[PDB]
Amino acid sequence: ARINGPDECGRVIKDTSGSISNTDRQKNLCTWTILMKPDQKVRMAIPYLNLACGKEYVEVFDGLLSGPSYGKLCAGAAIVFLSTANTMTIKYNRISGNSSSPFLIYFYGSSP
Amino acid sequence: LDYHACGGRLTDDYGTIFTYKGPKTECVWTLQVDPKYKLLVSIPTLNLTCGKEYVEVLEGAPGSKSLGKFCEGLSILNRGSSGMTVKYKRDSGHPASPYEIIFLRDSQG
Numbered sequence: 001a002r003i004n005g006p007d008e009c010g011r012v013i014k015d016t017s018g019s020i021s022n023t024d025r026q027k028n029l030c031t032w033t034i035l036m037k038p039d040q041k042v043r044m045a046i047p048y049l050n051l052a053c054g055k056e057y058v059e060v061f062d063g064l065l066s067g068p069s070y071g072k073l074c075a076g077a078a079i080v081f082l083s084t085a086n087t088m089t090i091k092y093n094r095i096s097g098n099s100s101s102p103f104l105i106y107f108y109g110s111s112p
Numbered sequence: 113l114d115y116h117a118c119g120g121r122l123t124d125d126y127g128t129i130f131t132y133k134g135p136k137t138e139c140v141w142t143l144q145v146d147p148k149y150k151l152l153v154s155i156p157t158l159n160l161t162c163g164k165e166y167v168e169v170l171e172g173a174p175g176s177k178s179l180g181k182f183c184e185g186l187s188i189l190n191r192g193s194s195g196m197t198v199k200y201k202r203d204s205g206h207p208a209s210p211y212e213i214i215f216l217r218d219s220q221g
Contacts, residue, residue: 043128045126047152080154108114110114
């Protein structure tokens with residue numbers, strides 16, 4: 001379903017599909033780990049990202065936070081990611097500030 | 113979600129269309145979205161056998177204005193409205209090459 005970003009920071013989302021909205025009122029640090037059935041891989045996409053580069057960034061990890069990083073990003077369109085296993089972590093971080101740049105994250109389980 | 117069928121009317125916030133491997137040589141997917149939003153179609157790193165197959169993007173239902181036909185392209189990005197169609201066609205006797213088309217509801221929140 002539709003997850004409200006700020007409410008779920010630090011938690012593991014178990015939905016087979018849904019969307020995470022960042023909101024313009026996000027914490028300075030927020031992490032979401034998506035957990036799928038062991039036979040699945042997670043597919044994630046951000047239709048449009050335009051963060052105040054230099055202040056904010058989003059980073060995706062293949063697995064948990066200790067897993068390989070896909071890199072920090074701040075802008076883009078049709079950004080897509082595929083994990084190698086049934087787990088994926090997304091981290092929003094803002095160096096100083098009160099407001100957040102809003103964005104949506106879509107996700108679903110891809111069972112080959 | 114992931115789709116592997118030969119065409120259809122799809123409604124999804126984030127969908128990934130993969131190579132249909134069945135006997136049909138032409139597949140047409142009509143993408144729907146809540147009309148309040150626009151669709152973002154992405155066909156990254158396309159590599160088909162030019163001359164034997166192609167992906168075509170239409171403004172609306174089949175028979176509508178064709179926006180383009182391609183077989184290779186590092187990145188093709190399109191923003192359209194609900195009802196937009198993606199079409200894949202190949203010659204009889206030519207096995208479909210691997211492709212991946214992504215459509216997303218374009219939104220920021």
